[PDB]
Structure formats: C-alpha cells, structure tokens
Amino acid sequence: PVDVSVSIFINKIYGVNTLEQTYKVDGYIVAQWTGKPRKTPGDKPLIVENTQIERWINNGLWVPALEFINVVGSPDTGNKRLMLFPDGRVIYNARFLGSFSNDMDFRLFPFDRQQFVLELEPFSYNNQQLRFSDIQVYTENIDNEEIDEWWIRGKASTHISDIRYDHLSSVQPNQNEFSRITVRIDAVRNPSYYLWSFILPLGLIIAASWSVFWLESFSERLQTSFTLMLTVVAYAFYTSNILPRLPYTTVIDQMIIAGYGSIFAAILLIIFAHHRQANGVEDDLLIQRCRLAFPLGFLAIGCVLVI
Amino acid sequence: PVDVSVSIFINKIYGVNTLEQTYKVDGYIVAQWTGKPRKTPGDKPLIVENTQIERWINNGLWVPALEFINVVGSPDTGNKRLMLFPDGRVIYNARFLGSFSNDMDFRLFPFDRQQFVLELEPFSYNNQQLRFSDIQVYTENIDNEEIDEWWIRGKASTHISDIRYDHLSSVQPNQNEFSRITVRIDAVRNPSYYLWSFILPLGLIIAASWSVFWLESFSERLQTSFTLMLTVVAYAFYTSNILPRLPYTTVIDQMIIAGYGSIFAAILLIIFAHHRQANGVEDDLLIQRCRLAFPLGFLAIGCVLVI
Amino acid sequence: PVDVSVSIFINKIYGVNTLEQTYKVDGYIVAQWTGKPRKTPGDKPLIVENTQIERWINNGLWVPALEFINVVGSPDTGNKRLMLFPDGRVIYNARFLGSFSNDMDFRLFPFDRQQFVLELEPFSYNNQQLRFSDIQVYTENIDNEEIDEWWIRGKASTHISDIRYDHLSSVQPNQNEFSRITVRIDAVRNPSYYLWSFILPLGLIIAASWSVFWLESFSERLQTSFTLMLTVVAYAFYTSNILPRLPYTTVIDQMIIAGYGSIFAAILLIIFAHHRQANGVEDDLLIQRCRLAFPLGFLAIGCVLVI
Amino acid sequence: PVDVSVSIFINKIYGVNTLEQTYKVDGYIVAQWTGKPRKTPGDKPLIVENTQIERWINNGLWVPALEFINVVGSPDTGNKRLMLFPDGRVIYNARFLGSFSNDMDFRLFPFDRQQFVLELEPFSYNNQQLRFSDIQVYTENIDNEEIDEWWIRGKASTHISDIRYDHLSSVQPNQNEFSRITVRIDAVRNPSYYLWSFILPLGLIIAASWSVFWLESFSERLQTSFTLMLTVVAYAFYTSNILPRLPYTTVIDQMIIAGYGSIFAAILLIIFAHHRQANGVEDDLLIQRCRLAFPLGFLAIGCVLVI
Amino acid sequence: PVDVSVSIFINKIYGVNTLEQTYKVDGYIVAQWTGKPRKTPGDKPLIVENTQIERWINNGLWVPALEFINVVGSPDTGNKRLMLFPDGRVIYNARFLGSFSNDMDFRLFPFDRQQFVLELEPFSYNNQQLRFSDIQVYTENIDNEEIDEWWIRGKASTHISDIRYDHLSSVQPNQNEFSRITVRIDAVRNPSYYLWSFILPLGLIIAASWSVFWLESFSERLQTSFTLMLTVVAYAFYTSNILPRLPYTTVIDQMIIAGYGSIFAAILLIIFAHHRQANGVEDDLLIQRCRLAFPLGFLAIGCVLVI
Ligand code: NA
C-alpha cells in the first residue's frame, strides 16, 4: 500500500445550522506520502502552485482525491499546493471550506454538549492501495471564551479505522475495505445570553401569572388572566423569532407550555371558585387560598420536568 | 442496446421547500456498463480520477450523460470517478447534490405522508441504444427517529419503465422511447413539536374564548371578547412566522378561522342577549345559558372538519 | 438566411418575485437548423454530448447563440446536446433555468391574471442571416389545480416577429432587423388561502370595530376603541409579514386603511356625541343611533372602492 | 492613442440595497475601436461568438478589459460578442449584471431623489494608450410609472473625464492619467404606498393619543395612556419590519419619536394635574383644558421638524 | 530572497456579520517584485491582461500566490493584471472581494470601537525565498461621516512581521519562518439611530413603568403593571428583530432586563403594601411613598451597570 500522513488545521468553526444538522469548517488540509524519486531542478525541492498541478497530473504524477465523507456538496477550495521533494516524498497542501453534517442532538438546548466531526477517506483507493499512517489535528486556535458562541473544550480526538463496504464485494473479491480518518472536536454552547434574556424573563412572567389569586373580584381575575395569556402568546412569538427552528421542544418550549397550563388552570380554578356557592350566598374563599400552593405545585412540576 | 446497472446511495434528505415543492438530496450515483476490452497498464484495472475523465472522453471513450429528470437546475457534482476494468466493463461513480422537485401534497400538514422521488434517465440515448438493467438503491442511512424531522419509513421503491416522447416521432421513425428509473422514498413528518406547541395552545386559547359567557355584565363581556380577539390575532401572527408558506390551509389554519368565528359569534350572541329585552326590564339570562352548548357546538364543528 | 425551428418544453414555473418583477422558468430548449452535409461515422447520426461541443465549435461547426432577452443574468445551463444527422440537419438540445423578467401588474392581488413571457432572439445574427421558422411550445405539464399556487390556464401563445434596432443603422446599411420569438403563458393565482385567512378575518374584525356603538358609557367606548385600534395595528403587522412587498396598495391594504378610518371616525363621533350637551344635562342618544348607519356607510365605501 | 466609442443599454435597475448603498444594473455594453486591417473570410465581416474570443486573444488580437469602477465584486457576464469588420474596426458586445455602489443619501426617505451611477474605465490602459471618444447611453426602457418602484426621470447624463492617479508616478514618469466614463441616471421613489399606509395611520394614531384629555377620571387617563404607548410600540415594530435598515432616522422614525414624546408628556401633565391640588379639594380642570393646545403644539413641532 | 512591495487600495468595507465575526472588504491589491531581465516587444513594457497570465505561468514565469490569512473561503477575484517591464521588474495588480474574519468585540454595542484586519502572507514561500519590503495601504476613500454606518477614523496601520510555524520543523531544518503583512483599520459605529430610536424610548417606557405608584387602588395598580409588562415584552420583541444576534448582552439587553426587574419589583411591593394591614383596617400609605425612591434606586442601578 501507500502511506499517507494527514495534518488538519482548523481556522474557525461557525454557521451551525440546527434544522439541517450541518456546520461550516474552514481550514487547511496537509497530505504527505512517498513515491519514486524524481530529479527536481537543482538541489532545492520543486513547488507547484495552484492551476499547475493539473499539468503534472496529466503528465503522469500520482495524487489521490481525499474527499470529506460528511461534507454537504463540494468544499470551497482556496489555494492548493504540491511540493515535490527530490528524495521522493510529496506534500499536498490545500485550503477548504464547506458544510459538514453530523447528528448534533439539540435537546437541552442552552446547555448543549455537541461535537463537530470531520470524516476523511480516499475517494477511490482502498486499504490495499492507500493507508493513513497517522493524523495530528492542529486546532491551536484557542482564544478567550467570553466572546465565543461555541466553547471549544479540550483537544481534538483523532482516530484511524477501516471501513468495509458490503456492496463492493460484487465486483471485488477480497479488497473492499477503505481507510477512514475521523476527527472529534467537542464544544459547549455559550449559555449566558439565553439564561439572562430568556430563562429569567420567563420566571418573572410566570410569577406574574401566579400573582392573579391576590385580587379581590372574580371579574378582575378573569380579565387579568386573559391579559396574562396575551402576554404569554406575545413572549412565545418573541422567543420563536430568535431560538433555532429545531423539530422538537427545548427547555424554553416546555417552560412556555407550562406557563400556558398555569394560566388555563388559574382560569378553571377561579371559575370553579365563583360557582361553588350553593345559592350565591357563599364566598369564594376556601379554595382561593391556593396562592401559596399554585407556585409550589408549579415548582414541583419544574423539578420533575428538569430531572 | 447497452445495459447499465445503477446503484444510488442516499446520504441525507433535507431542505424541504414547501412553496417551491422541492427538496435537496445528497448522495452518490454508481453506473456500470460493458464495452469493448482494453489493455489497461498491468493486470490491475486503471482508475481515472476527477478532471482526467475529459481526456479519455476526448480520446474516444464512450460515456453517457445520466441527468436527473426532476432536479431543478444543475446538481452540485463533487468528486467523480471512472474505473476501467481490463475485461471490458466500466464503472462510473459520482457524488451529487441538487434540489429535486415533486408534487408533495401538504394538506393535513402535521401528519403528512409524502414520498421523495428521484427520476433518472439518459440525456440522449433511447431504449434502442441504452437500457437500464436493474437498480438497487442503498438508502442504508437509518438512525434514531426522535431527532429526525423526517421519518424515513420502509425501503426505497425502485422501478424501471419506458417513456415514449410523442414529439420525437417527427425526426425519428420508430426509436423515440426512453428508459427511465424512478425511486420512491416514503417519509412521515415528525409531529411532536407541532402537536405540543401549536395544537395544544390553540385548544387552551379557544377554551379561554369559551370562558366569556361566565361573566356577569354585558360591558365586561364585550371588552373581554375584544381582548380575546386581539389574543387570537397575536397567536395567528405567531404561527404564521413558523408554519410553512404553502398556498392553502392546514389544520392549524382552519383552527384559527374557527377561533375567529367563535369570538365573532360570542359577540353577536351577547349583543343579541342584551337587546332582547322589551323595555330594558328583562334580564339576559335564558339565552346566556349557552355556556354548556357553545363548546359542544364547537366540538361538533371540529369533529366535522377533522373527518 | 438560415431557418431555425424552436421547440420549448416547460417543466415548472416558480419563484415569482413581486418587487423584482421576475420569475424562474425551468425547462428545455430545442433548436434545429440545416447546413451542408457531413459524413458521420457509419450510417447512424453522430451525437455530441456536453463538454465536447466546444471541440466541434473550434473545429469549425457553425452554431448560433440563442439568448433569452428577458432573462436576468445568465441561465443555469444543465446538460447540453448536439446531434448531427448525416443528411445535413443539426439538432441542438439544452436545459435552462433562470429568472425571467416581465411587467406583472400586481394590482388586485388575490385575483391576479398575469402572463409569463419568455423572449428568445439570436445574440448576433439578424433577419438576413438567421430566421425562426416556427415555434411549438410544449407546456404539457398540466396537473391538478388545487395544490398549485399558479393555475396555468389555456395554451401557450407563440408568435414570431421582427425587431428593428435603430442604433445599428450607424454601422450597418440595411441589415439591422432581428428575428424574435415571444411566448405567452397566462396564469391565475390560487385565491383560496388569501380569501379564507385574510379577507374573512378582516371582515370579522371590522364588524367588531362596528360593535362599539352598542356600549352604554362614553369611557367604555373610548377604551374599547383604543383596544380595537391596537387590534388593527396587530393584524396589519400580521399581514405585512406574509403579503408580498409590492410598492403599491392591494385590496387588503385598502381594507386595512378602511378599518383605520372606521375606528378614527368612531372615536370622533363618540367624542362629539359626549360634548354635544349644552350644560351636561342632555344625553348622547340621537347621534349615537348610527349603529345601523355606520356599517351601511362602510358597505357603501367598500362597494365604491371595489368597483 | 486608441479611440473607443462606448454604447451602454440599460435593461432594468433593481435591487436597491440601502444599508450596503448598492444596486443591481442589468444590460449590455458595446465597445468599438479601430485597428490594423485584416482579411476576413469572404467580403462579409467575421463574427466571433462566446468562448471563441479567447482563441483570437491567444492568437494575438488586441482587446482591452473595460471594468466598472463602482461594481461590487464581478459582474455576471452573459453572452459576449466580437465582430471583426474587414476595413479594420472591431465591435465588442457583452451583457453584464452586477451590484453597483454609490452614495445614495436616504434622508427624507419617502421622497428620495437619488441617481444611479455607472463608472467605466480601462483596467490597464491610460490616456496615452486608450481614449474614450464618446458615449451614448440608450436607457430607452421607459414605461408606465404607476407600477414602477423607481421613477426614472429625464435622460441619462453622460460625461468623459480624465482621472489622474498620484501613486502611479512612482513607476511612471508622465503617463499616469486614465480616461473614465461616468453615467448619471436620476430616479424618484414611488411614494404612494408609504404615504397611504404609513404616514396616514401615524396621523390617526397620534390623534388618538391626543384624544386622552377628553376623559373624566385620572385613573382612566392613566390606563388609556399606557394602552396607547403599547399601540405605539406595536406600530413601531410593524414599521421596522418593512422600512429599510438604513443607519439613520427618516421622517417615519421622527414621527414615531414624536408620538412617544406626546404620550410621555400626556402622562406627565395628567399626573401633575392630579397632584396640583393643595389638600385634594381642588379639581384638575384649569390645566386639563390643553385638549386644544396639545395638538397645536404638536403641529408646531411637526412644522419645525419637516422644514 | 525575493523582495515584494505591496500596495493595497480599499474601495469599501461593508457587510459586518456580528455572529460570524466577519466582514466584506472590496478593493485592489498591487504586488511588485524584480526578476531576471526579459526582452519585451519593443521598448514599451508588455502588459498581460486577464486569462493570459496562465499562458506565461505555463511558459515559465515565476509568480507567487498571495493569499489572505483571515479571508473566509475564496475571494471573488475580478480583473487581474501582470505588467512586465523590460528592466526586469514585474507588477501584479488584481481586484478582490471576500469575507475577512477578526475578533470584533461587540460588547458596548452602540459605542463600538472595532478595527478591520487584513492579513496577507505568501501561500508557499518562506522568509528565505520571499520577503515583503514595505506596504503602503491607500485607504483614501474618506467621505462625509453622517451617512456612513462605520466611521473610518485615522489612517491604516501597516506592519510587517515574521511568522514561525512550529510543525514545519518536522520536514524543514531551519527555514520555516514566513513573512506576514497585517493591516489595521480602526472604525467607530454610527450611534445616532440607536441612541435616538432605542435608548430614548427605553427611558420613556421605564419612566412609564415608574408611574404606577401614583395610582390610588391596588387593583388598578395590578392591571396597570400587567399591561406594562406586556409593553416591555412587545418592545423586547421589537428590538430583537433589529439588533444584531451576537451571543451576549449589550446595553439595550441589560436595560430591558432592568425594566423587567422594575416591573416585577413594583408588583411585589404593591402586593406587600396591600397585605401589610393587620386586619384590613390599615392603609397602604407608608411604603407606597416609594414613588420618589424607586426611580432613584433605578438610577443608581443604571449608574452602577454603565460604569
Ligand atoms: Na402585540
């Protein structure tokens, strides 16, 4: 086989699309293998820039096509390099930018722990014709974390495995196993803005909706509950415009549903309080002392739903 | 004719545009036919990478252009492969990404059952010069369904048919029939988020609008109805920003129209109740006992409109 | 001159941009002319696929450049074909997708009748060197109309005319007239969603704003009118997010302006009713019986503005 | 030097981006110069289509690169033409589409008067090697103005000037002056939709906020003022979604600020009216007769801010 | 080594993406080095336009690839120039447009001071084979500042440094140091629109929420506080649509949180005032005189949070 050493430099990770489960990765890829010796002009190694590699390819130089498995479409290739040492080894350097797909479980959204995966594999050559010797990912771009949306934690996990394709045994007797490189970069979301601007106003609004049982008349309680329901709808429409459009509920979504249920239960209990009188001579006083049990029940509901 | 075996690998299906009735499909396409034998260098088969296939094409190698019938514009072709076995058979491998168009009936939106169709056909060669032998679509990318917007159900349906073009008989005597491959991938929408965040708050809001007949004064009922109508407008504007912009009504749209009609009928009945008095000495009491018939009538309306 | 027969196939029409007055058309274009006879390899006609037409062009084969006059920018050309019959005639087949511009009067928006125009003309050759013999547009893609945003009505109108350019007489003595093909495809908008979700809630909201004169106190009428004005602003912001951003008013826009004027006139008449008393001893009763003339006046205003 | 006559045809002007201060222009550019005579095949002039001009360029034909100075990025070049007359003169025709940048003062937004500028200049050749003889811009596409967002007024102003670059004197002794063509196309915005849907509802809402001093109780005036402030916030959010995102205030922005100040001053004066009583025995009657001076003061403020 | 003088012209800076921490820069880049003398045709220097530089590159002319380090993806290269003087020196001129990445601290958003950085470096050649002699950035495009979103202050700071790569010592003994050019362009945001349309209505709304303690009844104070909370939610949703989507709080965000806390504290103090009575015979008068201490406490909170 042919041994290839891979070095991957990460410049930035951005553009996390939540519905598409994709994200953009910009950086360099370095590939280095060894072939038959050639006589470069002079003792110095010969460097081939962009748009001159194809001349060497047409002349007969061997170079493999290293695609990304999880990239969506084609990467945006910048400058590309091919440096030909006279002892025999060839170094390929290129710059890429593309949308890379992964699973990215977005449940528990403000406190996510999702890793970014770059999968690399030769497009054509199997384990018997092309092996990956080692990969050292240099994700050295680590900076201050308070201005970063994604907190890159730890170091990039690198692994080399063999991938066997079951359909390729129809045309190939024993050589259908491909060498693959997988890169794991674990990241944590910056939770400060969401916690300070979405979770806390939800708590204040839900306590405001708790505050309806301190009124003295049934009519005032009813119109107060309707205005509170309008407030919750307005805040739901406010948070829908900012939060990602993932196809399932997050903590903020369940908190909004909980506030909806709190207002509906408040309406039901105040109506049942008003009409518990036998002939209209009783007062709605015994059951309306749930002002110190409605928030405790809501806190129990929250403690159940968080855990 | 020339026999071509097609293998299609599906990597991901995403980007379902509802107004345009299109969707994105990313994956590989494998084509395999047989020609005259050639002497490859050595006993091993010769592999042609990207941007070297055109040299073989200009030299005289025959390769057909397999377009997608329902793709919109041009697919985003990634790496492409041409592997030339010495016994005679040629394997073409390429990666595509493009927007594929279909019918995609979006009535009954949260509980959709819509299939994704990939239609393939040679661009130039008819049934007498190019036949498709068989297709085996490997849509093996099946994962956990609770984090997927689209639930890919079952297995991909594959069929090979002959398509006859009526206009081509003006220039061709008897050979105007083209071979086509059609692929069906049935999917079901993930209904949990819509059911938990849109259907249930609609029910709570509609029950809140039912709650106006439990008030005691005509004026309070009127201002309560106006605040409720504002709530329904706010929630309609909330759901318009999230739901797709399809050109017809879904279940949520008819539920919003039903809430509009409920509030308008409530206004009409409370006004007619207030002025049913002959000289202002009667009380609005007989007709205002529709507090237990307005929701039953609405439930009958819902049972009629759902079925 | 040289005679060219054109066949245009329409696959889909979509992406109607209202502010830009453009729309996307995807389909095929077929051109067929006749030249000097050539000896194709064998008795069968020779077919030239994509990226091999340029070799024949450089070798000396004549082929004209048929641009679209009203396309914006460049069309997205898919696969292209050139089939060379041995008797002499050449058939050019290509697939296009681009944004085509037209007038598209969007007044009376829900009940529009706007035609989609494709204009075709040789880029270089005039009437004396290139004539269009006939065009038969095959817009055969006609389906069920209840799931289509645009109802394609009738058949495509085809016409061939000569276009004379006045500036080209400065360099050319008598040959400055170009042959042009114009295609008309008339379409009608699907009006069901707009009529059921925008026109009807406007009528319900305007009748609700009519309902303020049935109150009994001046203060209640004032706060009711202010809440109704907030409702109209909310619904205006709701319909602005969905309706197209054309630079002039549609029926919904004039209906919103009419509701604005209704609420303002209601405020003015209730204030003038309250202060028509000489010393505060009169009652606001004679002029407040406009509860059955304010909607009739609004209906007259609507009947005037619709016609 | 070499004389070049330029003819520019404007097809459409659209896509005015206000924050970026750019706009899209689609049309043709014609360039015509004269060189040494050549023997075309036959007496007829030889026409070079697209993708064959580069063959003539490589063979030795001289053609200059005419860039647009104010275009952003690269124009989207459609079909290009090169027609070679046998007497010696060469005509270059090409189609362009790109984003052109200008100043475009967007103060006084509904009644704007902004011109669209296309600047043209050779990329390489100075005044001593390439001169522009004359330009005649054919902006003949003039149509009915009631369906056009931008009213193209008058005729295109054309001027040819010499541009001297001060840095190029470091490498060039006396030849650093470049010939430039500047085109002015003055346009007026269509003000009907903004005036009918934004200015008039602002006036109605501001008169509604004027209407609070006709109430009889301090509490009713306070809650009415708070509901009016909510109405103004809602309308501000309504107009923010539609109006352009220019970095400074327009007439609508100052009108919204004026309404904000009107409601705040109303709150301050009603509170100061309620507590001007010495011991609560006086009535808030002398200062509350500003119902006919608050709108006059606002009209004076408007007359000052408009002029 | 080889000395290269760089001249960079800035045409416009726009498109500041806050979440991506990128921005667009359009302009020219001039590179000038010296090589072996060549015999140009005639005494005049020979100019190579676009799409003819590759012919000289294939023939053997040396030209380096100067990439931008911080550009995202590939720049949109317009026309490119190569002018070959006969004494030996070569001038390379090209036009670029791309998204350049930087840190761009967006804390204290309306009064930002952020610099735009362009980093330039040869793609292949180190300090021993390619040195940058000097750079003179001509950012001469300075205009009136009242219509500019970004106020370009001062002059562009230029610096040339050597960058040493630690990984390249594995293949290179002593030559792993690269020459880099860094350009600083400091800019100040235009703060007038934000200060006049966001900060001032926040102050008016917060003073309106201060105004609740001047009411006379506990119920009126409660419903007034709920309407005020709805107003704050509406204004929060209004400012979320316009302000950038940076992942942390700005001054407007903390002001909105402060208004939320003010309304919640007002609700808590009025409820505690109502129920401080021993048997309902006391009046809520001693603690309700915080009408002149609630705004002073808020002003102290603002003075603490601003500093
Ligand atoms: Na609202």
Ligand code: NA
């Ligand atoms: Na919105």
Ligand code: NA
């Ligand atoms: Na929006």
Ligand code: NA
């Ligand atoms: Na209210």
